[PDB]
Amino acid sequence: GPPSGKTYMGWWGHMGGPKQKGITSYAVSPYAQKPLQGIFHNAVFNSFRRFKSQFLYVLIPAGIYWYWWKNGNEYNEFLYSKAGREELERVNV
Amino acid sequence: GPPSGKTYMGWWGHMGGPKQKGITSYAVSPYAQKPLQGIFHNAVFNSFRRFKSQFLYVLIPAGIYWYWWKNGNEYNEFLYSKAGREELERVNV
Amino acid sequence: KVEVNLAAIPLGKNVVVKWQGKPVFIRHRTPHEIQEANSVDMSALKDPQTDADRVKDPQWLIMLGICTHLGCVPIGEAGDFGGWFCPCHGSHYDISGRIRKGPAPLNLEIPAYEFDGDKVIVG
Amino acid sequence: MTAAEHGLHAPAYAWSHNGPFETFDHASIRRGYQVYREVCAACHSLDRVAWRTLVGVSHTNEEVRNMAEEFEYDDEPDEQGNPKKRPGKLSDYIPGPYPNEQAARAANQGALPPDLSLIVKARHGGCDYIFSLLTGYPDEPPAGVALPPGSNYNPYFPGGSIAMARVLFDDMVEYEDGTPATTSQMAKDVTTFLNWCAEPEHDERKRLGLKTVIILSSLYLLSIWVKKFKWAGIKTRKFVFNPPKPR
Amino acid sequence: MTAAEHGLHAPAYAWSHNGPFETFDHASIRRGYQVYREVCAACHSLDRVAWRTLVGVSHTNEEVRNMAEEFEYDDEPDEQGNPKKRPGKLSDYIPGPYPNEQAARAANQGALPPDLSLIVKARHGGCDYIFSLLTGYPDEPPAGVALPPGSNYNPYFPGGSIAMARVLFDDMVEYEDGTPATTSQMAKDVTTFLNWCAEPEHDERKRLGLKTVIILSSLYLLSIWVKKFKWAGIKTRKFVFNPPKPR
Amino acid sequence: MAFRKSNVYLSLVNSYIIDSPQPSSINYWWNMGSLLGLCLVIQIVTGIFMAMHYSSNIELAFSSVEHIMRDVHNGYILRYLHANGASFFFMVMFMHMAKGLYYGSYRSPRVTLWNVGVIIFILTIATAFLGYCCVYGQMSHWGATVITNLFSAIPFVGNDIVSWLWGGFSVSNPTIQRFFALHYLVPFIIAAMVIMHLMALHIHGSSNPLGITGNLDRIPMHSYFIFKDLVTVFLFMLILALFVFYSPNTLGHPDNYIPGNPLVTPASIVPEWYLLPFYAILRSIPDKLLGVITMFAAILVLLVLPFTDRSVVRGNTFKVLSKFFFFIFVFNFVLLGQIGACHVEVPYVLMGQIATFIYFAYFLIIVPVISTIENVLFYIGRVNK
Ligand code: HEC
Ligand code: HEC
Ligand code: HEM
Ligand code: HEM
Ligand code: FES
């Protein structure tokens, strides 16, 4: 086939990153390692670190929308009660 | 992408034939030509040349198989008739 | 398994059932044509076979009226000894389903029929 | 198998719809409906032909409305849940003569009359077979046969013995256009009608086939020209070989 | 909308089949079949439940054979074509009281009793709704409702007005195991029988679910270990960087 | 570069149909593949628009087909187009295979292409058998019973695999609903296998009728072979419109207008015309297990062809004995197809046995011996010693 257009990812040998010099990487065989090392420390301290960093972003909009939903639900329950018909007619028409 | 195995057909520029030298080819624009040129001559003479070269290969096996089918069909229509019942009763029983 | 019973069908004319998609003889059975199914040629015609191991009820008769050759149908009670002309190739069976004719290789198949007493029901 | 087991082959009669530009004779279909209703409707069914398909082919709208209202179909049950009946309308289908298959086999000596709404496509020979079967009954079977009782000889039926006796006799129907209604004329008319019942698309199919065959033949020849015009430059290509100098 | 037209919500009863390892109490299914046959079968139908599904669940083989043979189904017609009846077999479905919708609406003042073979899956509330509906008929409709004639008050029904009167009263069915048949006892048994009729796969579904959840949680934890094993070399990989000398 | 090369999808379209370098020498037999593509699109589209009206129960199948014929607008066009287009698909597929084993296209660069072709052929045979079984006529039902009761010859698990095929105990409502779901399904497997057929073709390119290399002059597929394929497309549509509009029930059997009846055998059970040669192969062997083994061997013998062709030049363009015995094979196939439509009477069983033996002796005996003889004749006709 013909060659296609220029991409941003080559293959093994010509990926297309910059030239690399002076970076040395070391690694050990997994057969010589301990998997599940540090699971009981990461399960309590790392989990708390990640939760402390990323919970206001998730739980402030969740609190806003859940309070909005509960308030609208309470108003809909009030409007179709015996105590709140006399607002329901002047509310809908 | 990865490179795949050596094939026997490349693309426009590296087809993989031999080196060509000393072959010149000439061709005229079809807008300056006559299509349907020589169709009444080729229709009777070229078609007769093609038929004459390529008809024994087609019409000797066709003749053998058509004669076989005709003879077997005649034998069946003979054996399932009144005149040929004795040979039917000895050819199956 | 469908189960078809006795007392509503009298002595001496046919039933041909359709069970599991296939049609089969039953008859209430005749006195010396049961005992003409003791008169049988053993092997100067096609099969040496079995009226006891073919039908175990002495007085009633299902078996698989798929014709012998490759699967056609017979008539009821007009034929050989008072019986069953299959016109599929011109051949003939009655009160235990035996060949006296034609190109047919073997007799007919009998399914596992069992009883309300010895009241004939098929499975 | 023998010729008797095959049946005699029907000859090639000259139907008015044989041929690629032809059309059913619609007066033949109207007369054939009359012969069906007056003779064939006693034993055979027409289970696939609605009443509304006859309007504008063989009869007028009111002419079909009255023939449908002379029958009685199952209505929706009334407000107490009891079953009800109804005069027919154009939506309904042409009713058979029997309520089930066992009534049919009881009434016609064990044999079941086939439903005629696809019978010229269901039989090898088609219109020639139906015509030649209806008019093929000899006055006596050939000397030597043993016909079973309750059965009749017809050599175009495979095997010879058919359970339908000869039903068509001279002037048993009177046509409303004064045609001499003999055996051959009535068989011609029912076979044209049964062919319409099998193929009610026949006229439109042949007309559309004229349109497609003309358009596609023109497109085929025109595409031959455009192929030759495109490939002109390759069919008229010339190669010259001067052998290169040794180096 | 108003809680009246919503209907009051059924509370959470402690059913003996609520829970992921629980099974239908089959004695209560047998008693609930008795309650259906003696009370509910006058108006409602059960046409999705064959007779053979009851064998080995609530009754033996002989009992379902007798309970099927005490009914009449349509047979295939005789050799003369006349319609014929047949005593029921195991292959047949449980017949309903009315032959159509119109007989049902006639016999129940316009309303149609729903088929009960899927009714605990077809109502939001499940068995609790059915139990609360059967036992939730007050002696008087509360102060101020405009109850139409022929309609009864049940607050669990959406709107309040149900066209089914109170049909469960004490000791109207004698049980053959001597259980005291109160209103709540009969409502419990018939609701368990209706839940079996809706979900006859319930016990095998929960057993296969136990096998499947055990095998899949085994495989999930074991795959966590195999992923951490295969990825240990990439997780524990170290990079050092000495900046190269300029050239 | 051009946008037709610098895309993801248009790169594939360009590489396969626009800038594909074809050998300039290829004749009109190299249009059967694009013809089979057109046929496959015809079958899929007309089948979808008929499945919008088909009901698949055993009591509604036949009458739903006639509801398509009589009540659906232009539904006779759809049904006749689907049936005759299936038969035309098989005639064109037989021409594709006969071209392939005439011109030596099965040979050593293209053996995986030949094998993907054989898989496609098996799948189309299965698709058409299921689709003929969906209409539930009289030949449809009894064809289903004899072909499924073939599988009861396996001496251990045969009865249980035939009861698993049937969904019960003979061909009835589960069998017909199964055959509809599968007759939908197997065409999309065929479309996937056609994409794999094109992928296996594209690595080495197509052959040519000379059998010499075609690497020397080549032509892009657009504007030359697009129009040379358009010629045969319009011819094929013309001949199909003839058979659809003027002669529609010609290739079919009349007994598929009788509704399916499990109690009446139609006295000559034959399949559609294209399965007649394999039916005659199956019928020739006086055993059922060896019969189905020999029928599957008769279609799996196309795989021994790249290993029994013992000659150094590709194709029969320049050989006389290969041409002669090739056309003996082709008219043996036609006689086998005509034997498969006849009864088991006295000259026909011997004719079918001898024609089956010639069919198998072509691949296993005739092609090696004729290849070796033509090799040494090509040698000693032109070398001197
Ligand atoms: C009364 C009973 C009738 C009448 C008035 C007609 N038919 Fe015919 N028919 C009848 C039976 C019992 C049978 C079955 C015979 C058998 O052995 O199958 C038939 C058969 C046909 C056939 C099919 C023949 C075949 O299968 O090859 C056709 C077609 C047919 N009948 C048509 C027909 C027509 C057109 C009539 C017009 C007046 C007609 N029948 C009358 C019973 C009876
Ligand atoms: C006689 C008439 C009866 C008897 C003996 C029973 N039912 Fe009931 N039923 C009946 C009618 C006419 C209606 C329709 C009322 C309406 O307007 O919907 C019903 C309704 C039900 C429902 C549906 C409730 C709902 O729609 O939410 C269920 C569930 C139901 N019936 C069950 C039931 C049971 C378990 C009985 C046991 C003895 C029973 N019915 C008796 C008519 C009648
Ligand atoms: C691989 C391509 C296909 C082939 C070879 C094929 C073949 C057939 C054949 C031979 C028949 C019987 C025609 C007859 O005698 O009436 C048939 C019927 C049928 N096919 Fe297909 N078919 C194909 C694709 C499809 C697809 C994809 C569908 C579904 C979307 C489909 C739907 C049908 C239907 C509904 C019938 C019903 C009977 C009829 O209407 O004719 N077909 N098919
Ligand atoms: C759905 C069916 C099929 C389709 C769409 C298909 C498609 C194609 C196409 C488009 C080509 C290229 C054009 C050509 O050479 O004619 C081709 C080539 C080929 N096909 Fe098929 N094919 C199909 C079935 C088969 C079958 C059944 C076989 C044989 C077992 C087969 C074997 C081949 C071979 C050998 C070639 C290469 C021929 C050559 O160029 O020399 N194909 N196919
Ligand atoms: S089937 Fe009865 S003889 Fe062949």
Side-chain angles (χ1 to χ4, degrees):
Chain A
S4 175
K6 189 263 179 183
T7 76
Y8 292 98
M9 177 193 85
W11 210 246
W12 300 113
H14 49 94
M15 281 281 162
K19 309 291 198 61
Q20 293 177 44
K21 265 191 89 78
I23 299 168
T24 306
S25 70
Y26 309 82
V28 185
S29 160
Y31 288 77
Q33 288 193 16
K34 303 181 299 205
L36 320 170
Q37 178 261 357
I39 50 172
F40 299 105
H41 181 269
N42 294 327
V44 296
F45 286 105
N46 199 36
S47 313
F48 180 77
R49 198 255 319 153
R50 301 203 291 159
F51 179 77
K52 187 259 296 172
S53 179
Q54 313 274 353
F55 87 109
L56 286 185
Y57 305 113
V58 185
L59 297 182
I60 290 187
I64 288 165
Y65 275 80
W66 178 83
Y67 177 74
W68 196 19
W69 168 249
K70 282 301 134 180
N71 195 89
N73 217 6
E74 285 173 5
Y75 193 59
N76 186 80
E77 197 197 31
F78 165 76
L79 274 194
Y80 290 86
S81 68
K82 201 187 293 180
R85 47 173 313 269
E86 65 259 24
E87 207 183 286
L88 162 67
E89 82 264 354
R90 68 179 281 274
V91 154
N92 56 20
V93 175
Chain B
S4 174
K6 291 191 192 311
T7 61
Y8 288 102
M9 175 193 83
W11 209 249
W12 297 111
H14 50 101
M15 283 289 170
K19 310 297 210 66
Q20 299 182 38
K21 259 180 92 69
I23 291 171
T24 314
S25 69
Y26 313 82
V28 188
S29 163
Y31 290 82
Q33 286 199 1
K34 296 181 296 191
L36 319 172
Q37 192 265 353
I39 46 163
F40 306 99
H41 188 275
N42 289 329
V44 61
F45 292 111
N46 205 23
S47 297
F48 180 67
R49 196 256 320 159
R50 293 160 96 187
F51 190 89
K52 185 206 163 201
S53 66
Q54 306 278 348
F55 84 108
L56 280 178
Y57 309 116
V58 193
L59 298 195
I60 299 178
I64 292 172
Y65 274 91
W66 178 86
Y67 188 73
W68 201 14
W69 175 241
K70 197 210 178 190
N71 177 81
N73 210 6
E74 283 175 354
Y75 190 47
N76 192 58
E77 291 151 337
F78 157 76
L79 272 191
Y80 282 81
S81 71
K82 189 146 69 180
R85 55 166 296 257
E86 269 88 0
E87 283 316 280
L88 179 81
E89 292 178 354
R90 85 177 268 270
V91 80
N92 293 117
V93 174
Chain C
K1 289 175 66 167
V2 298
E3 321 296 322
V4 170
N5 209 1
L6 173 85
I9 298 170
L11 175 61
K13 188 55 184 174
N14 263 308
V15 189
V16 173
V17 332
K18 177 248 178 188
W19 156 75
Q20 191 175 353
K22 297 182 289 294
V24 11
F25 318 124
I26 209 170
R27 206 180 146 87
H28 206 161
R29 288 217 295 179
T30 56
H32 198 272
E33 212 188 331
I34 61 190
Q35 262 78 75
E36 205 265 343
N38 285 303
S39 298
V40 185
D41 179 346
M42 269 310 111
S43 284
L45 296 118
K46 305 178 169 69
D47 182 3
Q49 81 287 21
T50 63
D51 199 23
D53 183 74
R54 179 160 178 91
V55 63
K56 277 83 179 176
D57 202 340
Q59 59 155 354
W60 278 87
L61 188 168
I62 60 148
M63 63 277 304
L64 257 52
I66 297 97
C67 278
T68 43
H69 186 200
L70 277 84
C72 177
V73 70
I75 204 59
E77 296 301 287
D80 269 10
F81 317 126
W84 293 326
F85 177 35
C86 84
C88 309
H89 301 87
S91 292
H92 270 96
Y93 316 101
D94 56 6
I95 312 298
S96 296
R98 314 189 139 105
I99 322 175
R100 290 98 188 179
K101 306 282 167 320
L106 191 139
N107 279 26
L108 290 80
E109 190 169 0
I110 315 100
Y113 66 99
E114 285 87 8
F115 294 134
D116 300 350
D118 61 356
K119 272 60 154 171
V120 196
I121 53 166
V122 55
Chain D
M1 40 186 61
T2 69
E5 297 175 294
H6 270 304
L8 181 55
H9 275 271
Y13 298 103
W15 299 88
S16 175
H17 42 87
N18 281 164
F21 316 107
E22 313 289 329
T23 292
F24 283 136
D25 197 3
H26 281 195
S28 195
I29 310 172
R30 187 181 170 106
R31 283 176 297 187
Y33 175 70
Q34 198 199 339
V35 188
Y36 158 76
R37 175 59 67 215
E38 292 197 6
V39 194
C40 282
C43 318
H44 306 261
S45 178
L46 205 57
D47 280 311
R48 277 80 180 259
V49 181
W51 286 115
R52 46 158 171 89
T53 61
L54 277 74
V55 174
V57 161
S58 301
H59 306 76
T60 303
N61 190 21
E62 280 83 23
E63 208 162 354
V64 181
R65 266 178 195 248
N66 300 150
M67 297 178 322
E69 285 166 3
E70 290 321 293
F71 279 99
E72 204 167 2
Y73 294 85
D74 289 5
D75 204 353
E76 192 271 329
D78 68 322
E79 291 86 5
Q80 301 312 299
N82 314 122
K84 253 184 173 172
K85 304 298 274 290
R86 183 177 49 88
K89 42 186 63 177
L90 290 192
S91 300
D92 297 314
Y93 280 66
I94 288 183
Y98 299 120
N100 46 44
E101 186 206 324
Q102 280 84 16
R105 298 183 165 269
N108 314 308
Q109 299 196 40
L112 161 74
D115 164 88
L116 294 184
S117 168
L118 277 186
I119 206 74
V120 304
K121 305 215 276 197
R123 249 75 187 177
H124 163 237
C127 291
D128 311 322
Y129 175 73
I130 308 302
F131 187 88
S132 166
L133 182 75
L134 283 184
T135 54
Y137 285 103
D139 303 278
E140 182 67 28
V145 301
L147 214 52
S151 62
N152 320 90
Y153 193 80
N154 199 327
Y156 303 98
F157 189 81
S161 65
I162 187 177
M164 182 164 62
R166 180 179 161 173
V167 303
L168 287 188
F169 292 116
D170 290 271
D171 304 82
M172 81 194 294
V173 180
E174 61 90 18
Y175 290 135
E176 294 295 327
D177 47 0
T179 310
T182 180
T183 298
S184 302
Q185 173 67 39
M186 285 185 315
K188 189 262 291 175
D189 288 338
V190 286
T191 314
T192 315
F193 172 71
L194 297 186
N195 202 359
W196 174 82
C197 282
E199 298 162 329
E201 79 272 345
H202 177 276
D203 305 351
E204 204 60 42
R205 162 165 74 85
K206 284 179 167 181
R207 165 196 170 261
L208 290 184
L210 192 65
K211 287 178 67 159
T212 79
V213 157
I214 280 174
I215 279 177
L216 281 177
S217 294
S218 63
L219 271 177
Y220 167 56
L221 298 174
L222 193 46
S223 71
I224 285 182
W225 192 88
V226 180
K227 183 248 157 180
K228 291 180 92 78
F229 167 72
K230 297 297 179 178
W231 277 66
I234 309 292
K235 290 227 176 178
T236 63
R237 201 168 57 186
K238 295 277 190 321
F239 294 99
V240 177
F241 183 53
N242 316 282
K245 68 174 185 65
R247 182 61 189 95
Chain E
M1 49 188 58
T2 305
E5 50 184 348
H6 272 302
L8 186 65
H9 285 308
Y13 290 100
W15 296 92
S16 176
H17 46 79
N18 283 179
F21 321 101
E22 301 300 312
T23 294
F24 274 134
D25 192 6
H26 282 194
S28 68
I29 308 181
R30 186 180 173 98
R31 289 175 290 164
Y33 180 69
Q34 180 173 0
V35 178
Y36 160 79
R37 180 54 68 207
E38 300 204 0
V39 194
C40 279
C43 317
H44 312 260
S45 56
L46 202 65
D47 44 14
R48 272 74 168 263
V49 183
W51 288 112
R52 46 156 172 89
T53 70
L54 262 54
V55 184
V57 163
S58 309
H59 311 73
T60 182
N61 204 21
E62 295 83 357
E63 195 171 3
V64 181
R65 266 172 176 270
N66 298 153
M67 290 185 313
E69 285 161 1
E70 68 184 0
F71 281 95
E72 291 298 319
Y73 294 85
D74 288 13
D75 206 346
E76 59 94 24
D78 59 335
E79 185 60 81
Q80 305 303 299
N82 319 115
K84 197 203 285 182
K85 293 292 186 53
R86 180 183 44 90
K89 45 182 61 167
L90 290 177
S91 300
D92 296 319
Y93 284 78
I94 289 182
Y98 301 114
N100 43 40
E101 188 206 331
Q102 279 79 33
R105 296 189 168 271
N108 318 299
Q109 311 178 16
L112 162 68
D115 173 66
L116 288 187
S117 60
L118 284 176
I119 207 65
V120 309
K121 280 159 105 187
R123 292 297 178 272
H124 163 252
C127 305
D128 298 328
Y129 167 71
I130 310 298
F131 189 84
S132 298
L133 178 89
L134 289 180
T135 62
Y137 280 99
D139 304 87
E140 57 92 24
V145 288
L147 208 59
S151 315
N152 307 97
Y153 193 79
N154 203 321
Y156 301 100
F157 190 73
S161 299
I162 186 156
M164 179 167 61
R166 177 177 166 171
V167 300
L168 281 170
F169 304 103
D170 300 297
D171 295 301
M172 81 192 292
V173 168
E174 82 302 335
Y175 287 134
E176 66 182 1
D177 51 3
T179 307
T182 62
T183 309
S184 299
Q185 177 71 65
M186 273 179 313
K188 190 261 290 170
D189 296 340
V190 77
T191 317
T192 312
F193 170 73
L194 288 192
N195 197 13
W196 176 82
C197 274
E199 312 182 356
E201 75 266 349
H202 176 274
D203 311 342
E204 269 309 280
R205 159 159 69 79
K206 287 176 160 182
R207 200 202 92 195
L208 296 187
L210 190 63
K211 290 175 63 147
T212 297
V213 165
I214 283 172
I215 284 183
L216 285 178
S217 63
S218 287
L219 275 172
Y220 170 54
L221 296 179
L222 193 46
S223 75
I224 292 177
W225 191 88
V226 176
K227 184 247 159 185
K228 288 177 99 82
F229 172 73
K230 302 270 181 184
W231 269 74
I234 307 293
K235 297 291 284 285
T236 70
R237 183 175 63 182
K238 304 274 189 296
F239 289 95
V240 297
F241 177 58
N242 323 295
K245 298 297 186 291
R247 186 68 263 164
Chain F
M1 58 167 54
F3 189 76
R4 86 195 192 273
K5 306 189 183 183
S6 70
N7 209 323
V8 196
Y9 316 115
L10 291 181
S11 177
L12 283 197
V13 162
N14 168 83
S15 153
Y16 274 92
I17 78 182
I18 293 180
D19 287 0
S20 161
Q22 315 282 333
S24 47
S25 177
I26 55 171
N27 52 44
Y28 266 102
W29 301 107
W30 270 256
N31 308 109
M32 301 327 189
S34 57
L35 203 49
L36 288 162
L38 170 67
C39 282
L40 191 75
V41 176
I42 283 168
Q43 295 302 281
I44 287 177
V45 174
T46 54
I48 282 168
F49 279 95
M50 284 195 305
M52 284 181 171
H53 313 267
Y54 184 80
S55 311
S56 65
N57 303 72
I58 192 183
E59 69 260 17
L60 301 181
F62 192 81
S63 312
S64 57
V65 164
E66 285 101 43
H67 166 76
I68 290 159
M69 286 283 258
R70 310 177 174 248
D71 310 331
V72 183
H73 300 163
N74 319 103
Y76 60 97
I77 293 177
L78 301 199
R79 185 186 180 259
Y80 280 146
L81 198 46
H82 195 95
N84 302 279
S87 183
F88 264 36
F89 179 98
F90 288 144
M91 196 60 209
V92 174
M93 172 169 287
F94 280 145
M95 282 174 188
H96 193 61
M97 299 169 46
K99 182 255 296 187
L101 65 96
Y102 182 76
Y103 284 126
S105 281
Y106 53 89
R107 271 171 67 106
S108 283
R110 291 171 196 96
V111 193
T112 183
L113 176 68
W114 185 248
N115 295 344
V116 169
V118 173
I119 294 161
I120 289 184
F121 188 38
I122 279 171
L123 287 182
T124 57
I125 288 173
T127 292
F129 172 77
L130 302 171
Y132 192 56
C133 283
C134 293
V135 70
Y136 203 63
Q138 198 72 219
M139 287 307 153
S140 165
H141 173 94
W142 289 92
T145 72
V146 307
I147 298 301
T148 48
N149 202 2
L150 285 183
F151 294 93
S152 301
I154 310 184
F156 297 145
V157 294
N159 292 327
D160 289 334
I161 63 169
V162 69
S163 315
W164 174 78
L165 272 185
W166 281 339
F169 312 113
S170 292
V171 174
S172 66
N173 179 54
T175 319
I176 302 304
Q177 288 182 300
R178 264 164 213 203
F179 285 179
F180 179 55
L182 297 187
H183 170 73
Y184 193 101
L185 173 71
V186 192
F188 278 79
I189 303 178
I190 284 166
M193 288 289 190
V194 160
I195 281 161
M196 285 172 52
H197 193 64
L198 297 185
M199 281 172 29
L201 175 71
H202 188 75
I203 50 154
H204 294 166
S206 62
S207 186
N208 47 74
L210 296 166
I212 72 192
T213 174
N215 267 307
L216 278 76
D217 67 338
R218 270 174 184 269
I219 289 176
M221 205 178 158
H222 176 240
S223 71
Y224 295 90
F225 292 96
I226 289 306
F227 291 101
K228 196 190 176 118
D229 294 359
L230 204 45
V231 163
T232 45
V233 159
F234 283 139
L235 178 62
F236 160 84
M237 289 180 164
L238 169 74
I239 305 179
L240 184 64
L242 276 186
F243 287 92
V244 158
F245 282 101
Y246 287 106
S247 162
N249 312 278
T250 305
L251 303 165
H253 207 74
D255 280 18
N256 263 265
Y257 287 101
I258 313 176
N261 195 38
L263 311 157
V264 174
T265 48
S268 79
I269 307 158
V270 287
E272 278 270 13
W273 69 266
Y274 36 79
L275 296 165
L276 292 180
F278 312 111
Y279 195 55
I281 283 158
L282 161 78
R283 229 178 50 189
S284 65
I285 294 302
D287 196 357
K288 213 203 300 172
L289 178 64
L290 307 179
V292 297
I293 284 165
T294 306
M295 181 183 70
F296 288 147
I299 195 171
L300 283 194
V301 79
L302 314 179
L303 313 177
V304 310
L305 207 45
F307 310 111
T308 44
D309 195 17
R310 292 293 283 173
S311 69
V312 310
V313 299
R314 162 189 316 163
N316 311 330
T317 319
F318 304 121
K319 307 152 156 182
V320 301
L321 300 154
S322 297
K323 266 163 148 171
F324 185 66
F325 284 107
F326 172 75
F327 285 100
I328 289 176
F329 174 77
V330 172
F331 295 130
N332 192 81
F333 198 69
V334 177
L335 179 83
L336 193 66
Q338 262 155 0
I339 280 294
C342 296
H343 303 297
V344 287
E345 295 157 359
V346 59
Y348 297 152
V349 292
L350 189 56
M351 282 177 43
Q353 282 167 356
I354 296 181
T356 292
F357 171 68
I358 288 175
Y359 182 93
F360 279 104
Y362 178 70
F363 297 95
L364 302 173
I365 294 177
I366 284 177
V367 173
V369 176
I370 292 307
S371 302
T372 302
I373 285 179
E374 282 162 355
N375 280 352
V376 299
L377 286 180
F378 271 136
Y379 180 75
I380 71 178
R382 87 210 204 279
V383 69
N384 41 48
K385 192 158 291 202

